[PDB]
Ligand binder design. Structure first.
Ligand SMILES: NC(=O)C1=CN([C@@H]2O[C@H](COP(=O)(O)OP(=O)(O)OC[C@H]3O[C@@H](n4cnc5c(N)ncnc54)[C@H](OP(=O)(O)O)[C@@H]3O)[C@@H](O)[C@H]2O)C=CC1
Ligand SMILES: NC(=O)C1=CN([C@@H]2O[C@H](COP(=O)(O)OP(=O)(O)OC[C@H]3O[C@@H](n4cnc5c(N)ncnc54)[C@H](OP(=O)(O)O)[C@@H]3O)[C@@H](O)[C@H]2O)C=CC1
Ligand SMILES: CCCCCCOc1cccc([C@H](SCC(=O)N(C)O)P(=O)(O)O)c1
Ligand SMILES: CCCCCCOc1cccc([C@H](SCC(=O)N(C)O)P(=O)(O)O)c1
Ligand SMILES: [Mn+2]
Ligand SMILES: [Mn+2]
Lengths: 411, 411
């Protein structure tokens, strides 16, 4: 009586992690059917996944590699998947009755489109992509109010942690990204743990001159380049503060970022009695992904057991906002509300990418973002769902262009 | 629509802690009625509590201070409690329909009697007393199977922690101290945290010569002398391993003692997927006591918030069994089963008390306990509930006398 699951962004960090925990779990007993795989342009890698997982559906977003994908799949014998392309392909998969849960491991604002269609089709959405939440929080809430059986289950590790700390008895009275969620769950405050990233011990002088190469060495697993840069600036944690606010209905004043370099405590929830519950494991994404797919239950795994004596020491310190100004900008944008989160996310997409490509320096990232936020003026929020999406899209693109403009004017 | 609560052992460490969190909570809103107070012989202190809390019932176990208690209560005007005495008084309170929950803060094996009557009357039992569980685990289970609406809610801090880490959605399918509890809750393994006590850094040479005075300095709050000595020997943790086994149906091989000297993580549960959940706060008994009385809900308090940056470092190390042989003896007794836990608890009562009164040295505690365990032979467990209690009582007294004998023969 197994779980039918689609992986969106199957060839990326989250996607290959998700396929990995799926494969391992299926050895212990067959609980997952991989029904669909969706990627952007990694046609050869998708082919290879197809040969292993033989899903009912395959989709590739980039129209130019569509034929090529079809040609490659011909070489798998006794396998006749539905091979699809683009937004249309994505919508057809979201609307399949043979699909219960969708892992969203697509990066950036782009992730919002599949997230939205997943909800609209009343699916369980195992959402790793945080940019969607940060950019479109209010919209997603409204969609979730309309689509009663849709649910977002957080995969982002801290958010998974937070969610796992909750009493499902309370959780089942509501769902994530809903008014009153913190009241129903007796949540008072959140400790949002951070690795601190590679620059955590640098002086201001050293930070001035760090390069994307320095940033790209992230210890444990290979993540996408975008989150890796965000981890280096701690804008990733800035985004995750906003994500926390939206997922769990916690005020910004009740979200504390704490640098926990050992990455064993993944985050913590203080309840209204001041008791604190935390989730712990080695730094890893297999449990967040797995839990999203088994919630409200847990299944057996053969993961390496946490050994506290082996860990020995766990440390906690506040991040320096002077060293990590991206954190402050995120708090400011979150507290300001309106579409300030959209602008924050958009301007960061551009700043992140410029720094990645060695066009700007570290403190230029924050300086560009800060200037875009300063130039933005609050807009009335559309009451209508389709208009609100168009509004989100226009502000997102304006904010990207504005970021690019600031860059181009200082070049 | 408030909670009617009785405090057994009201004048002791747990009892005064329980009255304290009750008083504080009642300021935020009136949720608790203190319906009964029960003590052994602290007649003046009980009088004072009576004047403050004006409970419906008062009981004093020691018959010789009964009249005196009655005389003192005369001096409270417009207050006419039911003033009772002894086992009879205890049974009358347990059988009151005006009492929903009973905090058991009576020490030692003696605690079992009120625990048993509480269960027999279908009450919620907020059980701090662990000696009852260790000595009579199998019996309590059978009583709980018969009394469907009786429940033990753990107050012992690690056990509270463990219980708070569970999903109440699963918990409500069962109850503590029941077959299959770990299966229903997907529990795989327990990390049982320990302060390590005052002798944690002594050499073997230093341990040889420690005194009860050295032992009695326990940092944070004043606990009873008995648990304080047990903390010094780590027999307290030995007892808590057995308690864990019985409360949560976890095998001894899945219970790991870990010394966590900062006492922030109070204990941790590994689920079958290897995700770990822990409960955290400052070292304190107010939250364990409070949770026992509000479960399955939580209420607002004004307790001091946990501040992870302030804590800064958390450490974990395995205890040395050579330094703390009491731990090993407890594991051995637990694994052996039968009435070996009874004997362990009984012989420790005597050894603890001898060391308290400067009659023996530190390693004599373990040596006496070990010898009593070695002299014990498994007995067939009575099938009948009343006979099983008599059997528990006979073995408990035999084991005390045996401990005393070993002492007297080496003196
Ligand atoms: N890596 C991690 O451990 C964590 C990541 N996250 C979040 O998860 C998301 C994914 O990150 P990560 O896995 O690192 O990113 P990667 O760059 O590693 O992977 C991105 C994936 O998305 C696919 N993709 C891109 N555009 C499209 C599109 N239009 N349609 C379909 N698929 C598309 C890519 O396909 P292609 O291969 O064809 O380019 C690729 O499979 C991000 O939002 C990130 O913040 C959150 C927590 C941790
Ligand atoms: N202190 C703590 O923080 C913790 C304690 N515990 C457990 O809780 C229990 C209580 O410990 P603690 O509070 O330290 O002990 P204390 O010695 O501080 O208090 C014992 C209490 O029990 C009462 N008592 C003794 N015999 C009887 C009797 N026959 N009838 C009624 N009341 C009686 C005493 O009354 P009187 O004042 O008249 O002598 C006193 O009120 C123990 O089993 C201990 O292991 C567990 C976790 C932590
Ligand atoms: C074993 C030596 C430590 C290994 C460090 C592994 O990296 C981690 C570990 C945890 C968190 C993160 C963040 S980025 C990726 C992310 O968002 N995740 C995983 O949810 P952060 O830097 O923003 O806090 C990175
Ligand atoms: C602030 C500096 C640290 C303060 C230490 C406070 O003492 C504690 C703290 C926690 C545990 C205990 C044990 S004894 C008492 C007990 O059983 N409890 C509270 O449930 P242990 O020694 O057996 O682990 C004692
Ligand atoms: Mn994260
Ligand atoms: Mn304890």
């Amino acid at each position: 009586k197994p779980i039918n699951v689609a992986i969106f962004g199957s060839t990326g960090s989250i996607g290959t992690n998700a396929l990995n925990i799926i494969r391992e779990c299926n050895k212990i007993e067959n609980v997952f059917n991989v029904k669909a795989l969706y990627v952007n342009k990694s046609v050869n890698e998708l082919y290879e996944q197809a040969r292993e997982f033989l899903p009912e559906y395959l989709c590739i977003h980039d129209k130019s590699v569509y034929e090529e994908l079809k040609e490659l799949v011909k070489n798998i014998k006794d396998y006749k998947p539905i091979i699809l392309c683009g937004d249309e392909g994505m919508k057809e998969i979201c609307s399949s009755n043979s699909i219960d849960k969708i892992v969203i491991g697509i990066d950036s604002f782009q992730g919002l489109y599949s997230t939205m269609y997943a909800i609209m089709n009343n699916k369980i959405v195992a959402l790793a992509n945080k940019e969607s939440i940060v950019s479109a929080g209010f919209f997603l809430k409204k969609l979730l109010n309309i689509h009663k059986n849709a649910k977002i289950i957080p995969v982002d590790s801290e958010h998974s942690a937070i969610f796992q700390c909750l009493d499902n008895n309370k959780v089942l009275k509501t769902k994530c990204l809903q008014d009153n969620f913190s009241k129903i769950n007796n949540i008072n405050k959140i400790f949002l743990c951070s690795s601190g990233g590679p620059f955590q011990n640098l002086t201001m002088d050293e930070l001035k001159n760090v390069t994307s190469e320095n940033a790209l060495k992230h210890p444990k697993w290979k993540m996408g380049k975008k989150i890796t840069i965000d981890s280096a600036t701690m804008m990733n944690k800035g985004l995750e503060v906003i994500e926390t606010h939206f997922l769990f209905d916690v005020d910004y004043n009740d979200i504390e970022v704490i640098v926990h370099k050992e990455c064993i405590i993944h985050s913590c929830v203080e309840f209204i009695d001041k008791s604190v519950i935390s989730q712990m494991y080695y730094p890893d994404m297999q449990i967040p992904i797995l839990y999203s797919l088994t919630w409200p239950d847990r299944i057996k795994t053969n993961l390496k057991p946490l050994d506290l004596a082996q860990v020995s020491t766990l440390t906690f310190h506040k991040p320096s906002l002077e060293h990590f100004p991206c954190i402050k900008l995120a708090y400011q944008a979150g507290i300001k509300g309106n579409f300030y989160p959209t602008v924050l996310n958009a301007s960061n997409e551009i700043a992140n990418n410029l720094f990645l490509n060695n066009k700007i320096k570290y403190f230029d990232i924050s300086s560009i973002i800060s200037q875009v936020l300063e130039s933005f003026n609050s807009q009335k929020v559309s009451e209508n769902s389709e208009d609100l999406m168009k509004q989100i899209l226009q502000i997102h693109s304006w904010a990207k262009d504005k970021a690019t403009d600031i860059y181009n004017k200082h070049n």
